[PDB]
Amino acid sequence: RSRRVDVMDVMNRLILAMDLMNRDDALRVTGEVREYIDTVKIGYPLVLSEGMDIIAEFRKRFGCRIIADFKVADIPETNEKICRATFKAGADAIIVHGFPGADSVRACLNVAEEMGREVFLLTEMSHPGAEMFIQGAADEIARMGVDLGVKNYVGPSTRPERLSRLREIIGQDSFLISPGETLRFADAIIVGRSIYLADNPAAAAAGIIESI
Amino acid sequence: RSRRVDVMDVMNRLILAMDLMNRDDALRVTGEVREYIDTVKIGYPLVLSEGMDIIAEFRKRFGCRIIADFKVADIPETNEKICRATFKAGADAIIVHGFPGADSVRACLNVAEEMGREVFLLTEMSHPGAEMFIQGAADEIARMGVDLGVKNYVGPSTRPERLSRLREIIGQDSFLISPGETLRFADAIIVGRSIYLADNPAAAAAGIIESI
């Protein structure tokens, strides 16, 4: 897929899921692979353990974009506050669940529009438990996002036919990232453990990129 | 929209954004779609890589109009020199930023008037970062252009309501081009990747035109 001008440009189409919970380790390993990526996804284990100031620290030390994987899933008023605090801390984007409904998603979109940031809608998950309720709601959640003008989506990380289906629903221009061919549908892939748990993180990242 | 006599006539209302950086590839692909367009937009990657002589080469080999997308954004005296060098190299028009203010725009208008060429004012951009400062200044930049007699404008490439708003500010006769319905407000559309990265550039261009 060619890059679209109106959505984020992710270097090498590779997003590092920096899931380590210790600040020293997270910054050290990210430093080891800084030449391979310019976009890093950070979640709650690291931020709750080390403080939200870690977001700005990554942006300054590496010049990277930060996507806050906070899977926002509260009522509208609370979602608004979570997004505002996250963007105030410097996050370029935030990942939000769609199962709590349209008004909960809209609350996040309102803050992102006000602050000049982005919202990613999580349309589906791939852990086994996702089959109970998430899988059956995925197409409807993706359509809800499209209907509200969402332009960034996070999709499944195990089944290709699921990607083409999500791509079909969201259209050819919206931005789609997928954890884990894939780049024929998704605009970027997210890789974590395969890189940060590797004996040689740099080698792991370089291997993945050359393959891309 | 009907054509206005006092502004440029773009064949098929389609401008090719020839963004390839290699002279051979740029000339080859443009040759493949020459029957579909008579106006080509060239930017700095190609010109810096191959030399400004490439502008006259396009005009002679294809008989096309060249719009230099140089997003001129310097002080008045320097803008004057950039425009003069660009027009001396044969460009029919040049694209200029409005954020540096009125005197910077006027400097470009003076050289275009002297040399019988045209200035396009870039009123807004559509990449995500444009939300930080460009989006909030767009209406004021467009009004500044109108106030100085600018007759050619480059607008957003993602939101229709933005086009009608720009069209409202600039009036019904000025020339408006838009990257990427749209032709109800803009006089011509600019297409790049969808054509030059296509497996069959000619097919891509013909498809876009028949749709127009």
GROMACS .gro file of C-alpha atoms in nm:
model
  424
    1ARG     CA    1   0.000   0.000   0.000
    2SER     CA    2   0.115   0.354  -0.086
    3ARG     CA    3   0.128   0.617   0.190
    4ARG     CA    4  -0.173   0.847   0.227
    5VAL     CA    5  -0.095   1.214   0.301
    6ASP     CA    6  -0.373   1.273   0.552
    7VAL     CA    7  -0.267   0.999   0.793
    8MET     CA    8   0.050   0.944   0.993
    9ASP     CA    9   0.374   0.845   0.832
   10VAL     CA   10   0.533   0.556   1.030
   11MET     CA   11   0.899   0.501   0.944
   12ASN     CA   12   0.970   0.159   0.792
   13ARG     CA   13   0.603   0.074   0.855
   14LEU     CA   14   0.715  -0.074   1.188
   15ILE     CA   15   0.579   0.031   1.528
   16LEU     CA   16   0.770  -0.083   1.835
   17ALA     CA   17   0.544  -0.211   2.110
   18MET     CA   18   0.767  -0.117   2.400
   19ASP     CA   19   0.599  -0.327   2.668
   20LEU     CA   20   0.881  -0.342   2.923
   21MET     CA   21   0.770  -0.208   3.263
   22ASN     CA   22   1.097  -0.074   3.392
   23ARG     CA   23   1.204   0.273   3.274
   24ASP     CA   24   1.573   0.190   3.247
   25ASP     CA   25   1.513  -0.125   3.042
   26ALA     CA   26   1.249   0.042   2.822
   27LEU     CA   27   1.474   0.336   2.740
   28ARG     CA   28   1.781   0.114   2.693
   29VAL     CA   29   1.617  -0.129   2.451
   30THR     CA   30   1.441   0.146   2.259
   31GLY     CA   31   1.780   0.317   2.224
   32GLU     CA   32   1.923  -0.003   2.075
   33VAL     CA   33   1.665   0.002   1.794
   34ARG     CA   34   1.614   0.377   1.745
   35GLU     CA   35   1.749   0.375   1.389
   36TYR     CA   36   1.479   0.133   1.281
   37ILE     CA   37   1.163   0.304   1.407
   38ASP     CA   38   1.015   0.649   1.471
   39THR     CA   39   0.685   0.534   1.630
   40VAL     CA   40   0.655   0.361   1.965
   41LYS     CA   41   0.346   0.222   2.137
   42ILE     CA   42   0.346   0.246   2.517
   43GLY     CA   43   0.087   0.094   2.753
   44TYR     CA   44  -0.024   0.110   3.114
   45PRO     CA   45   0.228  -0.127   3.274
   46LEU     CA   46   0.513   0.114   3.195
   47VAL     CA   47   0.320   0.435   3.253
   48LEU     CA   48   0.163   0.324   3.582
   49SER     CA   49   0.497   0.193   3.707
   50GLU     CA   50   0.708   0.492   3.605
   51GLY     CA   51   0.471   0.785   3.560
   52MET     CA   52   0.316   0.956   3.258
   53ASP     CA   53   0.627   1.174   3.227
   54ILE     CA   54   0.780   0.879   3.047
   55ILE     CA   55   0.584   0.969   2.733
   56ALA     CA   56   0.757   1.305   2.690
   57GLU     CA   57   1.088   1.142   2.782
   58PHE     CA   58   1.058   0.903   2.484
   59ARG     CA   59   0.959   1.180   2.244
   60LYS     CA   60   1.257   1.391   2.345
   61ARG     CA   61   1.522   1.123   2.373
   62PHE     CA   62   1.428   0.949   2.048
   63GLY     CA   63   1.232   1.208   1.847
   64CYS     CA   64   0.955   0.945   1.816
   65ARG     CA   65   0.578   0.949   1.791
   66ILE     CA   66   0.404   0.792   2.090
   67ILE     CA   67   0.081   0.595   2.065
   68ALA     CA   68  -0.072   0.543   2.410
   69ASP     CA   69  -0.224   0.193   2.414
   70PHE     CA   70  -0.464   0.262   2.697
   71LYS     CA   71  -0.769   0.081   2.546
   72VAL     CA   72  -0.993   0.354   2.681
   73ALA     CA   73  -1.321   0.190   2.785
   74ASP     CA   74  -1.517   0.415   3.019
   75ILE     CA   75  -1.821   0.644   3.007
   76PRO     CA   76  -1.796   0.956   2.789
   77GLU     CA   77  -1.704   1.207   3.060
   78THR     CA   78  -1.429   0.988   3.196
   79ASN     CA   79  -1.296   0.901   2.848
   80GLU     CA   80  -1.269   1.275   2.783
   81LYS     CA   81  -1.058   1.323   3.095
   82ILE     CA   82  -0.832   1.023   3.023
   83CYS     CA   83  -0.768   1.151   2.672
   84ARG     CA   84  -0.701   1.505   2.785
   85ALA     CA   85  -0.449   1.391   3.051
   86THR     CA   86  -0.281   1.158   2.799
   87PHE     CA   87  -0.250   1.424   2.533
   88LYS     CA   88  -0.134   1.683   2.788
   89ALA     CA   89   0.146   1.439   2.871
   90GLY     CA   90   0.247   1.452   2.503
   91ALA     CA   91   0.099   1.142   2.341
   92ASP     CA   92   0.054   1.182   1.965
   93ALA     CA   93  -0.233   0.926   1.965
   94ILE     CA   94  -0.444   0.706   2.194
   95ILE     CA   95  -0.607   0.365   2.139
   96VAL     CA   96  -0.976   0.342   2.237
   97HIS     CA   97  -1.216   0.048   2.268
   98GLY     CA   98  -1.536   0.058   2.067
   99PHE     CA   99  -1.748  -0.185   2.268
  100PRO     CA  100  -1.866   0.084   2.515
  101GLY     CA  101  -2.045   0.247   2.221
  102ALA     CA  102  -2.054   0.555   2.005
  103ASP     CA  103  -2.081   0.827   2.263
  104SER     CA  104  -1.774   0.690   2.446
  105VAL     CA  105  -1.579   0.697   2.120
  106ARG     CA  106  -1.705   1.044   2.029
  107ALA     CA  107  -1.583   1.184   2.361
  108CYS     CA  108  -1.229   1.078   2.270
  109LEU     CA  109  -1.261   1.216   1.914
  110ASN     CA  110  -1.369   1.552   2.053
  111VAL     CA  111  -1.055   1.588   2.268
  112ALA     CA  112  -0.823   1.471   1.989
  113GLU     CA  113  -0.975   1.722   1.750
  114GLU     CA  114  -0.940   2.000   2.007
  115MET     CA  115  -0.577   1.916   2.085
  116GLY     CA  116  -0.462   1.825   1.734
  117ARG     CA  117  -0.395   1.458   1.818
  118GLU     CA  118  -0.533   1.124   1.696
  119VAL     CA  119  -0.762   0.847   1.812
  120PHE     CA  120  -0.716   0.484   1.703
  121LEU     CA  121  -1.024   0.265   1.731
  122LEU     CA  122  -0.950  -0.092   1.845
  123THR     CA  123  -1.183  -0.302   1.636
  124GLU     CA  124  -1.085  -0.650   1.751
  125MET     CA  125  -0.835  -0.838   1.967
  126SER     CA  126  -0.664  -1.171   1.909
  127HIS     CA  127  -0.627  -1.343   2.245
  128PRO     CA  128  -0.846  -1.655   2.281
  129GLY     CA  129  -1.101  -1.483   2.505
  130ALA     CA  130  -1.174  -1.236   2.225
  131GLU     CA  131  -1.400  -1.503   2.072
  132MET     CA  132  -1.661  -1.456   2.349
  133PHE     CA  133  -1.778  -1.111   2.262
  134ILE     CA  134  -1.519  -0.910   2.070
  135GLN     CA  135  -1.507  -1.116   1.753
  136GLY     CA  136  -1.883  -1.094   1.703
  137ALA     CA  137  -1.886  -0.719   1.748
  138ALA     CA  138  -1.583  -0.634   1.534
  139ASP     CA  139  -1.749  -0.553   1.202
  140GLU     CA  140  -2.013  -0.342   1.375
  141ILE     CA  141  -1.748  -0.157   1.579
  142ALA     CA  142  -1.545  -0.087   1.265
  143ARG     CA  143  -1.857   0.045   1.089
  144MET     CA  144  -1.934   0.264   1.389
  145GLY     CA  145  -1.586   0.416   1.358
  146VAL     CA  146  -1.628   0.483   0.989
  147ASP     CA  147  -1.964   0.641   1.056
  148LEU     CA  148  -1.805   0.882   1.304
  149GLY     CA  149  -1.515   0.977   1.079
  150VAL     CA  150  -1.249   0.772   1.262
  151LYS     CA  151  -0.936   0.759   1.044
  152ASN     CA  152  -0.708   0.530   1.246
  153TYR     CA  153  -0.777   0.168   1.339
  154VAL     CA  154  -0.607  -0.120   1.520
  155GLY     CA  155  -0.700  -0.463   1.382
  156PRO     CA  156  -0.646  -0.841   1.445
  157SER     CA  157  -0.305  -1.004   1.455
  158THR     CA  158  -0.361  -1.362   1.338
  159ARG     CA  159  -0.598  -1.391   1.042
  160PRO     CA  160  -0.539  -1.225   0.698
  161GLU     CA  161  -0.902  -1.257   0.576
  162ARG     CA  162  -0.991  -1.049   0.883
  163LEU     CA  163  -0.760  -0.771   0.760
  164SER     CA  164  -0.909  -0.756   0.412
  165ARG     CA  165  -1.253  -0.751   0.573
  166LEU     CA  166  -1.158  -0.463   0.805
  167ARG     CA  167  -0.993  -0.283   0.513
  168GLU     CA  168  -1.313  -0.332   0.312
  169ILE     CA  169  -1.521  -0.172   0.591
  170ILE     CA  170  -1.291   0.120   0.660
  171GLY     CA  171  -1.208   0.208   0.302
  172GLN     CA  172  -0.874   0.231   0.122
  173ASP     CA  173  -0.746   0.548   0.279
  174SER     CA  174  -0.784   0.519   0.654
  175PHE     CA  175  -0.483   0.415   0.857
  176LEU     CA  176  -0.470   0.059   0.984
  177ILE     CA  177  -0.210  -0.096   1.213
  178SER     CA  178  -0.185  -0.464   1.298
  179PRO     CA  179   0.008  -0.653   1.571
  180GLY     CA  180   0.254  -0.913   1.442
  181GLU     CA  181   0.121  -1.007   0.340
  182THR     CA  182  -0.017  -0.805   0.631
  183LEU     CA  183   0.116  -0.488   0.469
  184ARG     CA  184  -0.111  -0.541   0.169
  185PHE     CA  185  -0.399  -0.438   0.399
  186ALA     CA  186  -0.242  -0.272   0.703
  187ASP     CA  187  -0.026   0.041   0.677
  188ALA     CA  188   0.210  -0.063   0.956
  189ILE     CA  189   0.280  -0.362   1.176
  190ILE     CA  190   0.334  -0.359   1.551
  191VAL     CA  191   0.614  -0.573   1.692
  192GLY     CA  192   0.705  -0.609   2.056
  193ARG     CA  193   0.853  -0.926   2.212
  194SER     CA  194   1.015  -1.044   1.889
  195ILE     CA  195   1.227  -0.732   1.925
  196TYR     CA  196   1.261  -0.639   2.293
  197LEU     CA  197   1.306  -0.995   2.425
  198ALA     CA  198   1.554  -1.085   2.148
  199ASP     CA  199   1.916  -1.149   2.242
  200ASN     CA  200   2.005  -0.882   1.986
  201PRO     CA  201   1.709  -0.638   1.957
  202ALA     CA  202   1.881  -0.443   1.679
  203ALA     CA  203   1.933  -0.759   1.472
  204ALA     CA  204   1.571  -0.858   1.527
  205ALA     CA  205   1.442  -0.519   1.414
  206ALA     CA  206   1.672  -0.501   1.112
  207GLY     CA  207   1.564  -0.850   1.010
  208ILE     CA  208   1.198  -0.754   1.025
  209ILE     CA  209   1.254  -0.435   0.825
  210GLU     CA  210   1.461  -0.589   0.545
  211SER     CA  211   1.175  -0.837   0.513
  212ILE     CA  212   0.932  -0.545   0.473
  213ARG     CA  213  -1.774   2.464  -1.268
  214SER     CA  214  -1.738   2.636  -1.607
  215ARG     CA  215  -1.393   2.755  -1.719
  216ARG     CA  216  -1.304   3.120  -1.653
  217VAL     CA  217  -1.114   3.298  -1.933
  218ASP     CA  218  -0.874   3.492  -1.713
  219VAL     CA  219  -0.725   3.188  -1.539
  220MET     CA  220  -0.535   2.889  -1.671
  221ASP     CA  221  -0.698   2.618  -1.873
  222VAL     CA  222  -0.592   2.274  -1.737
  223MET     CA  223  -0.669   1.990  -1.978
  224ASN     CA  224  -0.916   1.736  -1.840
  225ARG     CA  225  -0.904   1.930  -1.511
  226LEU     CA  226  -0.629   1.691  -1.401
  227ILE     CA  227  -0.282   1.799  -1.287
  228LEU     CA  228  -0.015   1.530  -1.262
  229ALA     CA  229   0.192   1.556  -0.946
  230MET     CA  230   0.510   1.409  -1.087
  231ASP     CA  231   0.688   1.340  -0.760
  232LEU     CA  232   0.941   1.083  -0.878
  233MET     CA  233   1.299   1.192  -0.800
  234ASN     CA  234   1.483   1.025  -1.083
  235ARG     CA  235   1.486   1.204  -1.420
  236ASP     CA  236   1.457   0.888  -1.628
  237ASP     CA  237   1.160   0.755  -1.431
  238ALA     CA  238   0.988   1.095  -1.417
  239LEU     CA  239   1.016   1.148  -1.792
  240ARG     CA  240   0.920   0.786  -1.869
  241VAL     CA  241   0.605   0.783  -1.657
  242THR     CA  242   0.499   1.128  -1.769
  243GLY     CA  243   0.539   1.008  -2.129
  244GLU     CA  244   0.307   0.716  -2.053
  245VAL     CA  245   0.027   0.954  -1.952
  246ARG     CA  246   0.094   1.252  -2.180
  247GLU     CA  247  -0.235   1.218  -2.367
  248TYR     CA  248  -0.430   1.267  -2.046
  249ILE     CA  249  -0.276   1.586  -1.907
  250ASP     CA  250  -0.116   1.914  -2.018
  251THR     CA  251  -0.021   2.044  -1.669
  252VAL     CA  252   0.241   1.889  -1.444
  253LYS     CA  253   0.341   1.986  -1.090
  254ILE     CA  254   0.709   1.934  -1.006
  255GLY     CA  255   0.869   1.975  -0.662
  256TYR     CA  256   1.210   2.002  -0.500
  257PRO     CA  257   1.303   1.633  -0.474
  258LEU     CA  258   1.320   1.605  -0.854
  259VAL     CA  259   1.464   1.949  -0.919
  260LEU     CA  260   1.732   1.928  -0.649
  261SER     CA  261   1.829   1.579  -0.761
  262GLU     CA  262   1.839   1.648  -1.134
  263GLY     CA  263   1.874   2.023  -1.177
  264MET     CA  264   1.632   2.304  -1.263
  265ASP     CA  265   1.690   2.234  -1.633
  266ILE     CA  266   1.436   1.956  -1.590
  267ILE     CA  267   1.155   2.213  -1.597
  268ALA     CA  268   1.230   2.324  -1.953
  269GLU     CA  269   1.286   1.961  -2.050
  270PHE     CA  270   0.926   1.874  -1.949
  271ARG     CA  271   0.780   2.174  -2.128
  272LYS     CA  272   0.960   2.086  -2.450
  273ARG     CA  273   0.918   1.710  -2.448
  274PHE     CA  274   0.550   1.718  -2.352
  275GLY     CA  275   0.429   2.069  -2.442
  276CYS     CA  276   0.300   2.095  -2.083
  277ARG     CA  277   0.256   2.372  -1.830
  278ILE     CA  278   0.479   2.338  -1.525
  279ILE     CA  279   0.374   2.441  -1.175
  280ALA     CA  280   0.676   2.453  -0.942
  281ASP     CA  281   0.561   2.325  -0.601
  282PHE     CA  282   0.836   2.493  -0.406
  283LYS     CA  283   0.618   2.616  -0.112
  284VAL     CA  284   0.818   2.937  -0.103
  285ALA     CA  285   0.845   3.043   0.262
  286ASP     CA  286   1.126   3.293   0.310
  287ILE     CA  287   1.168   3.668   0.365
  288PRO     CA  288   1.061   3.899   0.082
  289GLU     CA  289   1.402   3.954  -0.079
  290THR     CA  290   1.478   3.585  -0.087
  291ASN     CA  291   1.129   3.494  -0.214
  292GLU     CA  292   1.187   3.738  -0.500
  293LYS     CA  293   1.510   3.564  -0.596
  294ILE     CA  294   1.362   3.213  -0.571
  295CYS     CA  295   1.073   3.316  -0.795
  296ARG     CA  296   1.295   3.486  -1.047
  297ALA     CA  297   1.526   3.182  -1.076
  298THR     CA  298   1.225   2.949  -1.104
  299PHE     CA  299   1.058   3.154  -1.375
  300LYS     CA  300   1.388   3.200  -1.560
  301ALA     CA  301   1.407   2.820  -1.570
  302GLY     CA  302   1.068   2.821  -1.747
  303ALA     CA  303   0.809   2.748  -1.480
  304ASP     CA  304   0.462   2.874  -1.574
  305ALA     CA  305   0.364   2.907  -1.204
  306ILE     CA  306   0.500   2.868  -0.850
  307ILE     CA  307   0.331   2.764  -0.523
  308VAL     CA  308   0.394   2.996  -0.225
  309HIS     CA  309   0.317   2.964   0.146
  310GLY     CA  310   0.110   3.235   0.308
  311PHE     CA  311   0.212   3.187   0.672
  312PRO     CA  312   0.523   3.409   0.640
  313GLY     CA  313   0.285   3.700   0.578
  314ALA     CA  314   0.177   3.953   0.320
  315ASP     CA  315   0.505   4.110   0.226
  316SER     CA  316   0.654   3.765   0.153
  317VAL     CA  317   0.359   3.688  -0.073
  318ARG     CA  318   0.374   4.028  -0.243
  319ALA     CA  319   0.740   3.976  -0.332
  320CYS     CA  320   0.642   3.667  -0.532
  321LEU     CA  321   0.346   3.847  -0.696
  322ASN     CA  322   0.576   4.126  -0.809
  323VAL     CA  323   0.810   3.888  -0.994
  324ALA     CA  324   0.523   3.692  -1.151
  325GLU     CA  325   0.365   4.013  -1.276
  326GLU     CA  326   0.699   4.130  -1.419
  327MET     CA  327   0.768   3.799  -1.594
  328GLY     CA  328   0.413   3.718  -1.706
  329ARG     CA  329   0.382   3.408  -1.485
  330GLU     CA  330   0.154   3.303  -1.199
  331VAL     CA  331   0.162   3.259  -0.824
  332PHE     CA  332  -0.051   3.000  -0.643
  333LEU     CA  333  -0.113   3.068  -0.274
  334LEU     CA  334  -0.111   2.754  -0.057
  335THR     CA  335  -0.389   2.816   0.189
  336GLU     CA  336  -0.383   2.490   0.385
  337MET     CA  337  -0.222   2.146   0.393
  338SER     CA  338  -0.372   1.809   0.481
  339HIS     CA  339  -0.106   1.607   0.659
  340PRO     CA  340  -0.182   1.546   1.030
  341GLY     CA  341   0.069   1.805   1.152
  342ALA     CA  342  -0.124   2.074   0.963
  343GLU     CA  343  -0.366   2.084   1.258
  344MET     CA  344  -0.104   2.252   1.482
  345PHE     CA  345  -0.085   2.584   1.310
  346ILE     CA  346  -0.189   2.569   0.945
  347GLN     CA  347  -0.553   2.477   0.990
  348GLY     CA  348  -0.616   2.771   1.223
  349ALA     CA  349  -0.456   3.019   0.987
  350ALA     CA  350  -0.614   2.896   0.663
  351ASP     CA  351  -0.914   3.129   0.636
  352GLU     CA  352  -0.699   3.430   0.725
  353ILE     CA  353  -0.432   3.329   0.471
  354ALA     CA  354  -0.695   3.287   0.199
  355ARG     CA  355  -0.840   3.630   0.281
  356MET     CA  356  -0.491   3.779   0.269
  357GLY     CA  357  -0.452   3.638  -0.083
  358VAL     CA  358  -0.784   3.779  -0.197
  359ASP     CA  359  -0.691   4.116  -0.051
  360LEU     CA  360  -0.370   4.120  -0.257
  361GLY     CA  361  -0.536   4.016  -0.581
  362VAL     CA  362  -0.411   3.655  -0.581
  363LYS     CA  363  -0.603   3.461  -0.848
  364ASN     CA  364  -0.470   3.107  -0.800
  365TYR     CA  365  -0.499   2.895  -0.485
  366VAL     CA  366  -0.408   2.548  -0.363
  367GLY     CA  367  -0.651   2.407  -0.106
  368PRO     CA  368  -0.707   2.102   0.125
  369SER     CA  369  -0.729   1.745   0.000
  370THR     CA  370  -0.955   1.565   0.247
  371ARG     CA  371  -1.259   1.768   0.353
  372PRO     CA  372  -1.529   1.899   0.109
  373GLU     CA  373  -1.677   2.159   0.351
  374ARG     CA  374  -1.326   2.308   0.355
  375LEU     CA  375  -1.342   2.352  -0.024
  376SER     CA  376  -1.675   2.531  -0.022
  377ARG     CA  377  -1.542   2.753   0.257
  378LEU     CA  378  -1.225   2.838   0.060
  379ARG     CA  379  -1.436   2.893  -0.253
  380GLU     CA  380  -1.661   3.124  -0.050
  381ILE     CA  381  -1.359   3.332   0.061
  382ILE     CA  382  -1.189   3.352  -0.275
  383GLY     CA  383  -1.495   3.416  -0.487
  384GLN     CA  384  -1.639   3.224  -0.782
  385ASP     CA  385  -1.383   3.319  -1.042
  386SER     CA  386  -1.039   3.260  -0.896
  387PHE     CA  387  -0.861   2.937  -0.982
  388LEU     CA  388  -0.851   2.666  -0.720
  389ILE     CA  389  -0.667   2.334  -0.737
  390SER     CA  390  -0.700   2.053  -0.486
  391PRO     CA  391  -0.490   1.738  -0.422
  392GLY     CA  392  -0.679   1.409  -0.454
  393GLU     CA  393  -1.761   1.637  -0.589
  394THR     CA  394  -1.430   1.820  -0.551
  395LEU     CA  395  -1.476   1.968  -0.899
  396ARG     CA  396  -1.790   2.148  -0.785
  397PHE     CA  397  -1.557   2.383  -0.593
  398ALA     CA  398  -1.207   2.329  -0.732
  399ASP     CA  399  -1.121   2.390  -1.098
  400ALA     CA  400  -0.875   2.100  -1.119
  401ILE     CA  401  -0.756   1.810  -0.909
  402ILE     CA  402  -0.397   1.707  -0.850
  403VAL     CA  403  -0.313   1.336  -0.864
  404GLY     CA  404   0.026   1.182  -0.807
  405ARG     CA  405   0.083   0.834  -0.657
  406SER     CA  406  -0.251   0.697  -0.776
  407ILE     CA  407  -0.106   0.749  -1.123
  408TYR     CA  408   0.274   0.722  -1.110
  409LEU     CA  409   0.290   0.426  -0.870
  410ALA     CA  410   0.014   0.237  -1.055
  411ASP     CA  411   0.105  -0.082  -1.240
  412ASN     CA  412  -0.048   0.080  -1.547
  413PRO     CA  413  -0.017   0.462  -1.512
  414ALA     CA  414  -0.209   0.520  -1.836
  415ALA     CA  415  -0.501   0.306  -1.715
  416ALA     CA  416  -0.502   0.488  -1.383
  417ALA     CA  417  -0.511   0.830  -1.550
  418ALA     CA  418  -0.777   0.731  -1.802
  419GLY     CA  419  -0.990   0.591  -1.521
  420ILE     CA  420  -0.967   0.915  -1.326
  421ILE     CA  421  -1.054   1.126  -1.631
  422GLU     CA  422  -1.355   0.923  -1.747
  423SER     CA  423  -1.480   0.966  -1.391
  424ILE     CA  424  -1.441   1.345  -1.427
   0.00000   0.00000   0.00000
